[PDB]
Design a binder for these strands. Structure first.
Lengths: 91, 97, 97, 214, 127, 197, 25
RNA sequence: GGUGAAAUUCUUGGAUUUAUUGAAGACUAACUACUGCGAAAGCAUUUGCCAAGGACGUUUUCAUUAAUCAAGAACGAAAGUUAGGGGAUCGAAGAUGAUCAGAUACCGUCGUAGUCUUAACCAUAAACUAUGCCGACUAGGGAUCGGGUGGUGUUUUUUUAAUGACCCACUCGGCACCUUACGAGAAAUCAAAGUCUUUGGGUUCUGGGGGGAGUAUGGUCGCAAGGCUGAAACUUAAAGGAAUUG
């Protein structure tokens, strides 16, 4: 069933902390919980071991990533910048 | 333009999926082409390349992960490596790709 | 009523073009609606061309011509005599002179 | 309270030998003081000058040139190329309605590491026997033309040094070879480089400067 | 055979900067403005005070050495009206009639490849 | 513990005598176990490589940067922070960097820093939602929580405290020329009120 | 009157009225 | 500096002005058109990459799979909201100098939110072609955009001997346009607003005098702003359109 309408994972907080704070943390809490892609085996096994650590349940590779995502947007653009810049460096 | 050539084989030709079946065929000498996904571990891909050098067979490197390889072959699981024992009427054996 | 067949502009199949600013009053008018005049104006007016011809150093000099594309909101365009309110039957005319 | 013109000596600028008459213009800074002489603060100037003067002929009335001074000897300043640009009047006159202009630009380093961003301009041309009113291009002629110009400019520059680069830019052979490679593709009216700007200047290597000056 | 300066003349409304420098472009020789000559708060943009500014410019570029000048006319440009004001032609005439020789006239007004927002609001000025 | 950024327990073969020395890096985004961190000036420009700032090209994103060579990391070591290499000066052998506080610092081109942003980004964008999480955050760092306001204290306990009405009383912006025990409030505030306007 | 400012006055009034309504709720 | 006429403002510590630059952000001028694309809102720097798309060509394939469309859904300018970044110009609010009789307005200077971006909202605009969508026909023309066909046509290193652009004549599609209205309309006007008192091609929505009133209330959606839905009491004999004379 639809147990709750829109608080979602932030329903455990009940009525406290204010609905805006609960909404702001809901979008981060779904992210730090959902299983993610694994760049090394292509499985939905990845889970946040710790704040910034993303272990794969299989193949035991852990990646340092964002505290609430396997790879944040600034990290993604840094990896793009490094790839592009090494591309000009090499050729 | 590799997925349709693969689709011809998966319907008509003969094939095996997975590392164990791939090396089994490579040591039997039946395999003529092996396709390795990029997602597969480097150790596996390197030893498969070495087996292919020993067996004088050609290796195709997939332009995608094992998920892409699985979908392209047509099996809804992940396939790291695919071996093509007897291709059908597909021209991939006479094709460099 | 509709005073003009093409409302005030040339916008048939766009919906939005781009605003521009009037060179006089800086009014934000769409570039196709604005009254564009291409000011082909020399540097030195003809009552001083011979004056500078004698005062010059180059025996033959080019007398450079300044070009400037003027965009006018019609509110100042017809205020500054550039274009004029015509009769209803003469509105259909589109001749440059 | 007292005229500071009384303490000037009216120095002179000297163009590279790869042009017409070396005499380009005068200048002035100040007398020679122990704290501040006349040679210490003089260097670093950009002389902006019409190429018509540097070539002694009227055909280059546009196409102005920027020469950057390096040293001083006696009352003479030794300048070196820095970059050219078309005069605004010529640019505006070239651009007219009812044709598409092609602008290209490629940034490369020459034989010596004078990285420069050469530009180029070109206009779609209404050839004779044409009754059409505007003669616009097809946005694929634009793409092809700027591709061929991007490679043509990188053939002319980065294949030589600034000396021969200026000595071949002034005679306008580059634009004619652009027309050579382009006339098969699309008719274009007047291809012009229209700009070059040096970006980085390496070690000062005065030997080449003295060779170009004397 | 004559020494070349650069006039770098900036004629807009509310000003006529007749600012002669040397050909190298850094050292100024009598930056004079029409606001320096007239005590009526709108004669500086008038063709008269443009002629006075160029007149004193010519007077103190003579007996100093400068003989021929590359006049670089310039409008306010930028994001502003970008049309040469009434002081331009009059100042050029003043330089021409003051004996100071003139070479290589051109308009160096700063045109934006695209400007920022123009002052005045969307509806612009309302007079 | 007491640090948002996870650490990479990197091991290096000791060049001089046979053993493996285990160094502790601040992990960047994208480093994973079984990755070959390449440290040195000849190293390639990849994520995780430690590169002297001369090697890196302009506009690159580097982190854990050395202030001076040998300092073993000073700049942009907190989670999600980075330093942008904006200038190279072989004439003075110095590199200009845009720095997380917006500063533009010149540091020696011999200085080195790991390539890529520090892991754990976005950590502070989720509110702690409660004193429990705030307390557990500071329990692993140091005794700086809770933080009583100076107004609520008594005049002995703070410059602000006291009064029949809870109020600072004097100007809160304390001069930098003040002395220990006076620097309670806004210190050397060049400007006050809402930023950006 | 315009179709804009009769509307805006009505909206100022509507905000005051919903404020009073919520206050009385 | 700025203005109708000024002043507030910056300024001998150097203002404004010049040259070298540097930095940042924003925009993509001219080219730019009775031109193009897009479902619309919209889209004007280069290149690369990714997919998408229409038109055309097609002696290709399937065989009615189609048109319209309540419910429901995606997108939806600007402004506005939310958290992060950046933050140059302009600039609500604001402060101010002017004018006026007054002027917390028009004009000037500075200036916050905003203007940009990332991720979420809102879901309205004179979102206009004030002309629903699909289909056929009815009148002519001349341009133009995209595609296609033909010319022993012009034109480019070599003067049919390595090939685009153009010219001519068609044809499909698109934005349109010019004349006449045979026709229609209240007329302005229209080539669709025509094939409607000689009234029936298919189909969805909306309107029933003006105000009150897009209001109250209820509901729902939104963080809010507000959106969507939506009266009535009472009140009035005009409101209104298009042309004519003054």
């Amino acid at each position: 069933a639809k147990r709750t309408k829109k608080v979602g994972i932030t329903g455990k907080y009940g009525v406290r902390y204010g609905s805006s704070l609960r909404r702001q943390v809901k979008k981060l809490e779904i992210q730090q919980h959902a299983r993610y892609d694994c760049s090394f085996c292509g499985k939905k096994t990845v889970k946040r071991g710790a704040a910034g650590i993303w272990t794969c349940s299989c193949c035991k590779k852990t990646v340092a990533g964002g505290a609430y995502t396997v790879s944040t947007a600034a990290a993604a653009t840094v990896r793009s910048t490094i790839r592009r810049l090494r591309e000009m460096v090499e050729a | 333009s590799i997925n349709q050539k693969l689709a011809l084989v998966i319907k008509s030709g003969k094939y095996t999926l997975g590392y164990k079946s791939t090396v089994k065929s490579l040591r039997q000498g039946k395999s003529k082409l092996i396709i390795i996904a990029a997602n597969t571990p480097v150790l596996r891909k390197s030893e498969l390349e070495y087996y292919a050098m020993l067996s004088k067979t050609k290796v195709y490197y997939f332009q995608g992960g094992n998920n892409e390889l699985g979908t392209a072959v047509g099996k809804l699981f992940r396939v790291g490596v695919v071996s093509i024992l007897e291709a059908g009427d597909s021209d991939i054996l006479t094709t460099l790709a | 009523p509709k005073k003009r067949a093409s409302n005030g502009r040339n916008k048939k199949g766009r919906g939005h073009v781009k605003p521009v600013r009037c060179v006089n009053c800086s009014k934000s008018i769409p570039k196709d609606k604005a009254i564009k005049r291409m000011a082909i104006r020399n540097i030195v007016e003809a009552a001083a061309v011979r004056d500078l011809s004698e005062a010059s150093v180059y025996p033959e000099y080019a007398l450079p011509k300044t070009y400037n594309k003027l965009h006018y909101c019609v509110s100042c365009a017809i205020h500054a005599r550039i274009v004029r309110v015509r009769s209803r039957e003469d509105r259909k005319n589109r001749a440059p002179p | 309270v007292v005229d500071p013109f009384t303490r000037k000596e009216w120095f002179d600028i000297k163009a590279p030998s790869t042009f017409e008459n070396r005499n380009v213009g005068k200048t002035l800074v100040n007398k020679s003081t122990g704290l501040k002489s006349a040679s210490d603060a003089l260097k670093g100037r950009v002389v902006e000058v019409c190429l018509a003067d540097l070539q002694g002929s009227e055909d280059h009335s546009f196409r102005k040139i920027k020469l950057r001074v390096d040293e001083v000897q006696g009352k003479n300043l030794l300048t070196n190329f820095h970059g050219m640009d078309f005069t605004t009047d010529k640019l505006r006159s070239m651009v007219r309605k009812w044709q598409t202009l092609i602008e290209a630009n490629v940034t490369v380093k020459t034989s010596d590491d004078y990285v420069l961003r050469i530009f180029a301009i070109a206009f779609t041309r209404k050839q004779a026997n044409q009754v059409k009113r505007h003669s616009y291009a097809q946005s694929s002629h634009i793409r092809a033309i700027r591709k061929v110009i991007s490679e043509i400019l990188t053939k002319e520059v980065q294949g030589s040094t600034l000396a021969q680069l200026t000595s071949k830019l002034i005679p306008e052979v580059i634009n004619k070879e652009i027309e050579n490679a382009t006339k098969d593709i699309f008719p274009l009216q007047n291809i012009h480089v229209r700009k070059v700007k040096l970006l980085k200047q390496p070690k000062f290597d005065v030997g080449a400067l003295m060779a170009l000056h004397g | 055979s004559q020494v070349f300066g650069v006039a770098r003349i900036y004629a807009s409304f509310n000003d006529t900067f007749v600012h002669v420098t040397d050909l190298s472009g850094k050292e100024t020789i009598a930056r004079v403005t029409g606001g320096m000559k007239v005590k009526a708060d709108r004669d500086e943009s008038s063709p008269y005070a443009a002629m006075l500014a160029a007149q004193d410019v010519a007077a103190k570029c003579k007996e100093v050495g400068i003989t021929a000048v590359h006049v670089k006319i310039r409008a306010t440009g930028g994001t502003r009206t970008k049309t040469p004001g009434p002081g331009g032609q009059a100042a050029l005439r003043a330089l021409a009639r003051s004996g100071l020789r003139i070479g290589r006239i051109e308009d160096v007004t700063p045109v934006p490849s695209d400007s920022t927002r123009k002052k005045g609001g969307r509806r612009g000025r309302r007079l | 513990s007491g640090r948002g950024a996870p650490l990479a327990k990197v091991v290096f073969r000791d060049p001089y005598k046979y053993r493996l020395r285990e160094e502790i890096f601040i992990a960047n985004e994208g480093v994973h176990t079984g990755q070959f961190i390449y440290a040195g000036k000849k190293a390639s420009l990849n994520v995780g490589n430690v590169l002297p700032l001369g090697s890196v090209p302009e506009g690159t994103i580097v982190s854990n940067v050395e202030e001076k060579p040998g300092d073993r990391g000073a700049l942009a070591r907190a989670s999600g922070n980075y330093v942008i290499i904006i200038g190279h000066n072989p004439d003075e052998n110095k590199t200009r960097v845009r720095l997380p506080s917006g500063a533009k610092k010149v540091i020696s081109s011999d200085a080195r820093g790991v390539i890529g942003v520090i892991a754990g980004g976005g950590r502070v964008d989720k509110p702690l939602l409660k004193a429990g999480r705030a307390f557990h955050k500071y329990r692993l760092k140091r005794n700086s929580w809770p933080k009583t306001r100076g107004v609520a204290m008594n005049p002995v306990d703070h410059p602000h405290g006291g009064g029949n009405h809870q109020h600072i009383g004097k100007a809160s912006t304390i001069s930098r020329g003040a002395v220990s025990g006076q620097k309670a409030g806004l210190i050397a505030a060049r400007r006050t009120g809402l930023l950006r306007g | 009157m315009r179709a804009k400012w009769r509307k805006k006055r009505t909206r100022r009034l509507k905000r005051k009225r919903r404020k009073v309504r919520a206050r009385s709720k």
